[PDB]
Swiss-Prot record:
Modified residues (Phosphoserine): S106, S107
Positions of region (Interaction with EML4): 20-120
Post-translational modification: Reversibly phosphorylated on serine residues during the M phase of the cell cycle. Phosphorylated by PLK and other kinases.
Induction description: Up-regulated in actively dividing hematopoietic precursor cells. Up-regulated in cultured erythroleukemia TF-1 cells by granulocyte-macrophage colony-stimulating factor. Strongly down-regulated during maturation of erythroid precursor cells.
Protein's recorded name: Nuclear migration protein nudC
Family membership: Belongs to the nudC family.
Role: Plays a role in neurogenesis and neuronal migration. Necessary for correct formation of mitotic spindles and chromosome separation during mitosis. Necessary for cytokinesis and cell proliferation.
Name of the gene encoding the protein in the UniProt record: NUDC
Distribution of this protein across tissues and organs: Ubiquitous. Highly expressed in fetal liver, kidney, lung and brain. Highly expressed in adult pancreas, kidney, skeletal muscle, liver, lung, placenta, prostate, brain and heart.
Localization, UniProt: Cytoplasm, Cytoskeleton; Nucleus; Cytoplasm, Cytoskeleton, Spindle; Midbody
CS domain sequence ranges: 14-105
Length: 120
């Protein structure tokens, strides 16, 4: 069933405690900050973008994201990087490019999509 919902951010995505994302009809952009006492390198990260699954986290630690995506993405046109100041960013290209997602992964509360503003 459905559960309690969150108000969408100005980018039509969600602000969660550990990450935030925005979207258009065709893509989604995620930011995942890490607060660590070392320089964040690829070797420290396990990130796996699958057709309908996403995993993001530090090696040896509980993943920050590890869940079923709201809908399918084109892996070949999706990507991630470690941006300055230890912020991991992920870009997802949607397969159905005319659909508002209500959440990144199924374990997150949905945003209230009634409040989406297509113009942004």
């Amino acid at each position: 069933g459905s559960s309690s919902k969150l108000k969408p951010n100005l980018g039509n995505g969600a602000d969660l405690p550990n990450y935030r994302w925005t979207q258009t009809l065709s893509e989604l952009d995620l930011a995942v900050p890490f607060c660590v006492n070392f320089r964040l390198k690829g070797k420290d990260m396990v990130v796996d973008i699958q057709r309908r699954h996403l995993r993001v986290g530090l090696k040896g630690q509980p993943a920050i994201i590890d869940g079923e995506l709201y809908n399918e993405v084109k892996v070949e046109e999706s990507s991630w990087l470690i941006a300055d100041g230890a912020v991991v960013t992920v870009h997802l290209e949607k397969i159905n490019k005319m659909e508002w997602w209500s959440r990144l992964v199924s374990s997150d509360p949905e945003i209230n999509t009634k409040k989406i503003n297509p113009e942004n």
